[PDB]
Amino acid sequence: SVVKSEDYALPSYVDRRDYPLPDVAHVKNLSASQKALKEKEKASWSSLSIDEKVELYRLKFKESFAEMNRSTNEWKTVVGAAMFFIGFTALLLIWEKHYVYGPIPHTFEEEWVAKQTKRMLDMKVAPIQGFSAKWDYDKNEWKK
Amino acid sequence: HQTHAYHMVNPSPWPLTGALSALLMTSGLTMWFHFNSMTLLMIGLTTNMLTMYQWWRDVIRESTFQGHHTPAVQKGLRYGMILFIISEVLFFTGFFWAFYHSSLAPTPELGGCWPPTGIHPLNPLEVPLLNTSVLLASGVSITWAHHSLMEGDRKHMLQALFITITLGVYFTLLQASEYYEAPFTISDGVYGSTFFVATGFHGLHVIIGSTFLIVCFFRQLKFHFTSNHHFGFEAAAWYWHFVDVVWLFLYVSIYWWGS
Amino acid sequence: HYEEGPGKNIPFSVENKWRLLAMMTLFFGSGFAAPFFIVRHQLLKK
Amino acid sequence: ASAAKGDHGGTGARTWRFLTFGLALPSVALCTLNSWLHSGHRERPAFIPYHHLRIRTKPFSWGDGNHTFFHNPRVNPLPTGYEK
Amino acid sequence: FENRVAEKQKLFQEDNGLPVHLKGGATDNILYRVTMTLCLGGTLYSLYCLGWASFPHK
Amino acid sequence: ASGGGVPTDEEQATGLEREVMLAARKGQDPYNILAPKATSGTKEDPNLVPSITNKRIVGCICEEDNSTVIWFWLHKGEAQRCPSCGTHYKLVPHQLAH
Amino acid sequence: APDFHDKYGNAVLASGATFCVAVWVYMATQIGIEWNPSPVGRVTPKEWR
Amino acid sequence: KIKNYQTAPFDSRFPNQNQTRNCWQNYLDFHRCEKAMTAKGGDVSVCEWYRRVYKSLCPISWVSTWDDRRAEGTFPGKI
Amino acid sequence: MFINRWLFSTNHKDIGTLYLLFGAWAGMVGTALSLLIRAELGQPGTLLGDDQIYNVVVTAHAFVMIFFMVMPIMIGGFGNWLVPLMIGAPDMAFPRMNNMSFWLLPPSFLLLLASSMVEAGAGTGWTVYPPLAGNLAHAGASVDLTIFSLHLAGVSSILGAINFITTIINMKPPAMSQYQTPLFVWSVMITAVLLLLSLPVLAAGITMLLTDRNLNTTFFDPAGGGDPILYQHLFWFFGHPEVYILILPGFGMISHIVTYYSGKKEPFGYMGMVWAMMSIGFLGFIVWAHHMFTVGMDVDTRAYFTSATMIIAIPTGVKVFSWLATLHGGNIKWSPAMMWALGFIFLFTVGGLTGIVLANSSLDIVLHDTYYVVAHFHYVLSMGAVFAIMGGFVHWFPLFSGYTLNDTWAKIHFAIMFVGVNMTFFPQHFLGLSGMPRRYSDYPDAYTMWNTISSMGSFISLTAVMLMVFIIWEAFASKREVLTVDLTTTNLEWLNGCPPPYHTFEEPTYVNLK
Amino acid sequence: MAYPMQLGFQDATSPIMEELLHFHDHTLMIVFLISSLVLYIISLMLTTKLTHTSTMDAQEVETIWTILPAIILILIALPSLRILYMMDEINNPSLTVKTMGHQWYWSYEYTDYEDLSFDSYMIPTSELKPGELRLLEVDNRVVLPMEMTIRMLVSSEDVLHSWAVPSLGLKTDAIPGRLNQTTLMSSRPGLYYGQCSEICGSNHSFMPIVLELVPLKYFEKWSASML
Amino acid sequence: STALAKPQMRGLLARRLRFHIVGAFMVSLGFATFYKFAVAEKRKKAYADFYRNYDSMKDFEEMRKAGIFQSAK
Amino acid sequence: ITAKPAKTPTSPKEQAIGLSVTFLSFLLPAGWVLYHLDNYKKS
Amino acid sequence: HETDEEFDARWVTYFNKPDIDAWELRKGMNTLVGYDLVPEPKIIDAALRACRRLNDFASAVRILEVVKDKAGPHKEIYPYVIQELRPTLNELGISTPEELGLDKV
Ligand code: HEA
Ligand code: HEA
Ligand SMILES: CCCCC/C=C/C/C=C/C/C=C/C/C=C\CCCC(=O)O[C@H](COC(=O)CCCCCCCCCCCCCCCCC)COP(=O)(O)OCCN
Ligand SMILES: CCCCCC/C=C\CCCCCCCCCC(=O)O[C@H](COC(=O)CCCCCCCCCCCCCCC)COP(=O)(O)OC[C@@H](O)CO
Ligand SMILES: CCCCCCCCCCO[C@@H]1O[C@H](CO)[C@@H](O[C@H]2O[C@H](CO)[C@@H](O)[C@H](O)[C@@H]2O)[C@@H](O)[C@H]1O
Ligand code: CUA
Ligand SMILES: [Cu+2]
Ligand SMILES: [Mg+2]
Ligand code: NA
Ligand SMILES: [Zn+2]
């Protein structure tokens, strides 16, 4: 039952799928009725009751395979919380845009862009695949 | 109580004073190079010397006087020293690389030849040959010294080690004088640069090694070494061979082949 | 000899979690603040 | 190589002392002779202000910033030539 | 010279609880105090120097 | 040509150095310089593990050339077995310094 | 006996997701960030010379 | 006469990315030739190919510095 | 008492702890620097000033992340804490010298900060190439302070390498051969060898820069017949080995972490892993000029450096596959450390592969000095080295401290970091292929989108770094004391308890020769 | 030039750059395949409750995972090296042009026949003409004849720079005291942009390169007009 | 009251591995085929088709009239 | 790994404090600098 | 290595050692579950009987749990095994984990 720091050098108990029979019993000290139960265990197990069998199991082991291998709802907390902090990051970005960044260059104004785009087309920027390739020079429009 | 053979060292201030003295020397150099002042530097050099002195004193206390240097400890010190020497070889390696790089592809600024136009190298058959015979001989006397110490011979140890130191000192004086006499300087392009920096760090190592030998000499005077336990001496001797071998590479490359 | 065990093999106290919070804050905070204040220092010279 | 001598029955103190005084020191004495003979000041070459030499990208941190550390007046010209 | 190593072994093996760097006696303490004073002093002074160099002198 | 005046380890070695040296001469290894030799490691012939306390870490290289070493505390009392190969070890507590 | 995740999992996931989507959509579209998307299919080229 | 030059041709002596020596060499060759011809009583025009090649390859500032140095007596190459 | 213990230490665990503290603090500095980078690049135009201030920031970022965070944490911290425990040694061979290796770091760092405070800082790139780094283009004390900072870090690491090599060769149980030492230990030994051989060459190179700047030498100055390219060879002769130094102990910790959380007693193909680390260590000394494909080098040299660089893929591949083989058939524990490790395996592979792209000098002509290089190295450093450090930190924190982290919080932390670093660096591949140069404070308008998204990702990372501090505070605040650790039979470092006593292995382990 | 949201290389302008695009597609395929396989096997290892935790034999599967990657490397190195030697092939250029790096601009020298040289500076953002590109335009472009083999010689008069034009697959470092050679051949007329590619101080970001490719006849008359 | 059949009880992990490594291999070839069609061949045919009837003078002339060149009006 | 229950439990509220104070110690000083950047850039 | 039948026989014999002790019981099971297989009914039969000789009911039940676990997603295996073990389970009075409620989380 109760494990202590200064027992680290002693054989200990674990619940592990791949180490089914640990080095010590889950419970080492036995009450009077528990002692009587260990005695009865020396006779035919058919005479043991279901409750007695469960009790013998629970003396030897802490959790069953089913208990130890159970899944949990941790993922919800984890994913939820990560989304929360990513969301919080957006607030930092908002603060930064508002108070730190000035206006961007004039070359991003809509009219500048429209003129630059024509010029890029007149110069046939990336004419094979990247940019001008996507412009229909015959119909004077973006390729549908 | 331990039942292994290694040395648990007493908590020590020397690592800290060592590190701080590094900060004072590097700061100091900065201060000297840029703010025309030598004071930080002088302080750094002082604490550096005081650190080295006490630290190695303590090593002597721990070994000769306290007995912590079991064979397993001694074996560790051997690897330590070998590893240290390897690291020094690689340091020198960089300077040789620089030398071979400049001199094998002399650029148009130099006249496109080696030695560069306007450089008149020292004659390698003069003082540099003398320097070579000095270090080589010292390699011999130090081996005599080692053997005498293993054979339990106090007097001849002291004689051979003295001779070895005198030779070290000789090389140093000859080199000081060459430096003074040399018609080229550290500022005479890559010729002066590689020459003085490589032979300069070498000279520094000769001074360190001589000093280490002198420490050995005094420890021997004080009977510290036994005929079988004397690592400090071996270490100094390995270091000393290292110094000698770097010289032979300097001689072949820079004085002879680079002339 | 020295104190051993959880919370004793370390150069800082973990006796009080609030004092600890303050220390960690100063420690990691001074690290993080430094470059901003160095940037500021450069900007305000020339 | 094998040098030209012999011993090898046992390399001890006696042998290394033999080499110290029989070979090493005599070589140092010979080279010392050779050196303190081929010495004598050779005549300093005409000064030519070559741009690959007498480099000054920053003053030296001693003296007047323009003399190398082991400046020898006799043989090391300044960037503007030999000294008086 | 005579071999006085045994006296030094007795001194440094004295069970007085002193760390090796202080075990020689009162001079160890003085030399330690000089060293540490020069180092701590010098370090404060290097911090002062950085402070000074950190600002333009036009 | 020759004389003396250099102390020997016998005369001058001290502290732990001296202890290792004297121990070695009596064929003993109180400071664990040597690798102990395995017994057959059965229940009847267990590996004898000296100790100055009541437990000691054993590392068992189960088969020659295994790269994996199996580590466990060996306690005073009944022989324990290596959890990987079952070879037996028994603690033999105390002494070293008389 | 139900742990932190059994009691709060669903809420932390729901309100975490909602918050993150809301504030990223807001930052992406409402505060004047220039993403500089491709002109292709969006910009009408205009005379520049 | 044997000319009609576009640019310095491939030269198997300097086949790599670093062309510094190609400039230098052709610079020396031109000025060597020029000195040979100006001395022994002959014509500079036979030096012309080296002049074209170095002019094509060498940065103006290099040529310019080299020429200043030849005037000054500080040119480190042999002419 | 306090001074004797923390300023005068000769204890390998205390000195490990000092290194981790130092390392964590450096990480905060390195993180701030990297936010400044990404703030400047987060929208087109000028935020801070011209390229000088900008590159002062870039340079300090790299120096701090490499010499003050990664190396101190992996080698100083994990190395000192774990190596003696994993071989049952009572300490390091040179316990006092070990302390000096630590105390050299604060002064080193102080020198780096000084150089950024005097004059206009060292805006040179962490490579510190002349002539930009020389005394005319970078007049005054900043570059000299940088050089001296590197000298101190260098001495720190050379002495540390000597200490680790000696400890690992000389202080194992007599019956334990080299082929019975854990992979972490191997990884640290091989690292130490590379340090011992490569740092002195850098030392030589930067000394030469120091003398060109202050003593009128001309190693790198064409005027005096020197060569700027000689500097590059000296620096990279160190610099490639350096990156293997930064990843090897990571590889070491990955092997333990993966083995542990797979519930295996041993890594798959131990000898193959030893072989692979050795081969990588050796090959990393003969490939340095792949940093120089654009400097004007002969075609055959370029052919050789391309081919020798590529071969590194083979041993590295054996490692990657062996990690997967270790997972195979495991009883997988999905701990936070395991997540770091699994991320490590994938993202390191990606970065390694983009390194293989760069090995081809043909294509490197176009990629060199672009963001494609930046994306390659941040995959292997910001996701590689850092993931291994995080994995190691969470896995061993309970051994170092005696306390447990909150696992949920740690998984949250992993998740945020993972999104952060990917958002930061993945788009930089596009920026590189399309030609955005390195070390720019501003870029032509076309590159705006990927730079925006990259800076956003860097803010997410910032969030993860903040959360990390809170997580460590929470562990120390709550004081959940470790009880039982599984698999001690194959993880010696855990067997003396958490934390272990000040003195461990005063009585050495017993190992039979048989 | 690069265009907004670009994912890959700028379109090839020279036969060499086309060659690098095909070689990069080939390598990228291999990069996707291997990293996607790794990710796949990770997930495979991780998605079963079946276990096998006893000692696994290694000397058999290590063959496969050494030989396969070795084969893959050779399949990269072959086309890698073919391209590398192509780029080195003797070509006989019609024209030699030098460029010198400076803080912070480029100068060009065309000194085959006449003494032509000029400085090339970034157009300041405040002075862009409508439709011009921020940080990319220069006052004086490097006019060159299209469809001809040109030898570019690169150097610097101060710190390192590096001369790059991504569309033509070019990048040559500019090192003082050194004269680096590359060759340039555009398949098409037009304007081809690049940027200084070695950190060179305060304005490293602001010393771009603009090539103007036109027919020989227009190049000749430009040269003449530029003396 | 029917018994159950003895199922396969050995090598379950190995068998799963073999099955899926073989599957990974098949997907790899399918992606290699796809990629050498939607990327590699697509690229070669784009360049081939572009240059097949490309007229560089005509291209120049269009550029010139649009006004883009310093050296040609 | 198994562990004892916290010796000094840190409740949700206490965590919210530690987390706030942590984030604040990173955000406030940087925020201050960045916010006053313009004041620095021309003064 | 060896054939399937030799392996199983080797394990049957291991567990059938009349005077098998507690340590060998554990070592046997803990080693056996490392392999890529679900132990054959005959091997489990032998292990269970060893549990009986060692008066250890709880380990018998834990053995049945480990069989289930080793089958992973192959849900057919465990009930086949139990079916084959039924005479043994009746003879020794071993209740299954399911009969004991130990299969519920
Ligand atoms: C931890 C740090 C680290 C590591 C481990 C590496 C590892 C590698 N690096 Fe690099 N690198 C850096 C950090 C690192 N790098 C940094 C910081 C720079 C920039 C320096 C500067 O300029 O500032 C840089 C720059 C750099 C360049 C220069 C690019 C340029 O500047 O133009 C090159 C070119 O060859 C290169 C290549 C490689 C290669 C081939 C590897 C290999 O070691 C990777 C091998 C791994 C794999 C290949 C993946 C695993 C293998 C498999 C899954 C098997 C199958 C694979 C194949 C069949 C290919 N790196
Ligand atoms: C390990 C080295 C390392 C790391 C981790 C990083 C991390 C990051 N780097 Fe860095 N970077 C370099 C090394 C590194 N970098 C180098 C060498 C260069 C080239 C410099 C040059 O050109 O000269 C460079 C260049 C570089 C540039 C290009 C500059 C330019 O060309 O103009 C950019 C821009 O986006 C960038 C950004 C970032 C970002 C956002 C992170 C973020 O991912 C960081 C998020 C924070 C962390 C990942 C780390 C925290 C870890 C700890 C705090 C320890 C925790 C404590 C314990 C566990 C106890 N970096
Ligand atoms: C007699 C032979 C013994 C040599 C030692 C001599 C004493 C001086 C002290 C310095 C020792 C340091 C060694 C190497 C340093 C660099 C150059 C020294 C070599 C030297 O001594 O060269 C002298 C130049 O001195 C100069 O500038 C020197 C100016 C002195 C400033 C020292 C510079 C300090 C540089 C610090 C570098 C330290 C970094 C190393 C890191 C190690 C790894 C961390 C040559 O004189 P000259 O007048 O040019 O020519 C002679 C003309 N008649
Ligand atoms: C003007 C002069 C100043 C110049 C600056 C440098 C100054 C000089 C440094 C000279 C080095 C002195 C070293 C003295 C060390 C004495 C301590 C010692 O030697 O300690 C010995 C151990 O070796 C050990 O630690 C081995 C210790 C090895 C030290 C190695 C020395 C190299 C230092 C190099 C530092 C410079 C860096 C180079 C710059 C590029 C003690 O063991 P034993 O000898 O077996 O004794 C025990 C027996 O008695 C038992 O019977
Ligand atoms: C790169 C990492 C950094 C990420 C971004 C930082 C996240 C934001 C943290 C907020 O920091 C504060 O924000 C303020 C405003 O929101 C400040 O008030 C300033 O501005 C005010 C409001 O307009 C005044 O009330 C005050 O005087 C004050 O100076 C300022 O001092 C600062 O401490
Ligand atoms: Cu010029 Cu960067
Ligand atoms: Cu590299
Ligand atoms: Mg470059
Ligand atoms: Na910007
Ligand atoms: Zn065993």
Short mmCIF file of N, CA and C in Angstrom, two decimals, chain B residues 7 9 55 73-81 83, chain I residues 10 15 91-101 159-160 162-167 170-171:
data_model
loop_
_atom_site.label_atom_id
_atom_site.label_comp_id
_atom_site.label_asym_id
_atom_site.label_seq_id
_atom_site.Cartn_x
_atom_site.Cartn_y
_atom_site.Cartn_z
N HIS B 7 39.83 10.44 -6.98
CA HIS B 7 40.03 11.56 -6.10
C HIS B 7 38.85 12.47 -6.10
N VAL B 9 37.93 15.93 -5.00
CA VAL B 9 38.70 17.11 -4.71
C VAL B 9 37.94 18.01 -3.74
N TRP B 55 46.66 26.65 -7.71
CA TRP B 55 46.02 25.47 -8.24
C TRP B 55 47.01 24.34 -8.32
N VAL B 73 44.31 7.37 -10.75
CA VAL B 73 44.31 8.82 -10.89
C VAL B 73 45.40 9.26 -11.86
N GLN B 74 46.57 8.65 -11.69
CA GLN B 74 47.73 8.92 -12.54
C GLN B 74 47.41 8.66 -14.02
N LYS B 75 46.72 7.55 -14.26
CA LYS B 75 46.29 7.17 -15.60
C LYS B 75 45.36 8.23 -16.19
N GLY B 76 44.47 8.77 -15.38
CA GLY B 76 43.62 9.84 -15.84
C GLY B 76 44.44 11.06 -16.22
N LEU B 77 45.41 11.41 -15.37
CA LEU B 77 46.26 12.58 -15.67
C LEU B 77 47.03 12.43 -17.01
N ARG B 78 47.45 11.18 -17.30
CA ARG B 78 48.12 10.85 -18.57
C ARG B 78 47.23 11.14 -19.74
N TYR B 79 46.01 10.62 -19.72
CA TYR B 79 45.12 10.91 -20.82
C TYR B 79 44.94 12.39 -20.89
N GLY B 80 44.80 13.04 -19.74
CA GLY B 80 44.52 14.47 -19.76
C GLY B 80 45.54 15.26 -20.54
N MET B 81 46.79 15.00 -20.18
CA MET B 81 47.93 15.63 -20.82
C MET B 81 48.04 15.27 -22.28
N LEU B 83 45.60 14.42 -24.35
CA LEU B 83 44.49 15.19 -24.93
C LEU B 83 44.80 16.69 -25.06
N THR I 10 33.09 21.05 -6.76
CA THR I 10 33.85 20.00 -7.46
C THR I 10 32.89 18.82 -7.60
N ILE I 15 27.54 20.96 -10.74
CA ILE I 15 28.03 21.67 -11.87
C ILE I 15 27.08 21.49 -13.07
N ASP I 91 32.58 10.64 -9.82
CA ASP I 91 32.53 12.03 -10.34
C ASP I 91 33.24 12.05 -11.68
N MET I 92 33.56 13.23 -12.21
CA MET I 92 34.37 13.35 -13.42
C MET I 92 35.89 13.20 -13.05
N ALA I 93 36.74 12.90 -14.02
CA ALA I 93 38.12 12.74 -13.72
C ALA I 93 38.73 14.00 -13.10
N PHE I 94 38.29 15.19 -13.51
CA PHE I 94 38.98 16.44 -13.16
C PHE I 94 37.91 17.39 -12.65
N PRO I 95 37.45 17.11 -11.41
CA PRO I 95 36.27 17.70 -10.85
C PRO I 95 36.43 19.16 -10.70
N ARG I 96 37.66 19.64 -10.52
CA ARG I 96 37.93 21.04 -10.23
C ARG I 96 38.01 21.75 -11.56
N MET I 97 38.80 21.22 -12.47
CA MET I 97 38.80 21.77 -13.83
C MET I 97 37.35 21.87 -14.42
N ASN I 98 36.52 20.88 -14.12
CA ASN I 98 35.12 20.89 -14.54
C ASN I 98 34.44 22.18 -14.16
N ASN I 99 34.68 22.63 -12.93
CA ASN I 99 34.10 23.88 -12.43
C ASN I 99 34.56 25.08 -13.23
N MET I 100 35.83 25.07 -13.68
CA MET I 100 36.32 26.20 -14.44
C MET I 100 35.64 26.25 -15.80
N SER I 101 35.45 25.09 -16.45
CA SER I 101 34.67 25.04 -17.66
C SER I 101 33.36 25.74 -17.49
N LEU I 159 38.56 22.20 -22.39
CA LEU I 159 38.79 21.59 -21.10
C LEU I 159 37.69 20.61 -20.76
N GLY I 160 36.47 20.96 -21.10
CA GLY I 160 35.37 20.02 -20.92
C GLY I 160 35.52 18.74 -21.74
N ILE I 162 38.35 17.43 -22.78
CA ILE I 162 39.41 16.64 -22.15
C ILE I 162 38.86 15.88 -20.91
N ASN I 163 37.95 16.54 -20.17
CA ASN I 163 37.40 15.97 -18.98
C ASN I 163 36.49 14.80 -19.30
N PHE I 164 35.64 14.98 -20.31
CA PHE I 164 34.71 13.89 -20.70
C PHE I 164 35.43 12.70 -21.30
N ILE I 165 36.35 12.97 -22.21
CA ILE I 165 37.10 11.87 -22.77
C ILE I 165 37.80 11.06 -21.67
N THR I 166 38.49 11.74 -20.73
CA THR I 166 39.24 11.04 -19.71
C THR I 166 38.27 10.28 -18.81
N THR I 167 37.22 10.95 -18.34
CA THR I 167 36.26 10.29 -17.51
C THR I 167 35.69 8.98 -18.14
N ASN I 170 38.55 6.24 -18.71
CA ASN I 170 39.28 5.81 -17.55
C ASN I 170 38.43 5.44 -16.36
N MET I 171 37.16 5.82 -16.31
CA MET I 171 36.46 5.68 -15.02
C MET I 171 35.24 4.79 -15.06
#
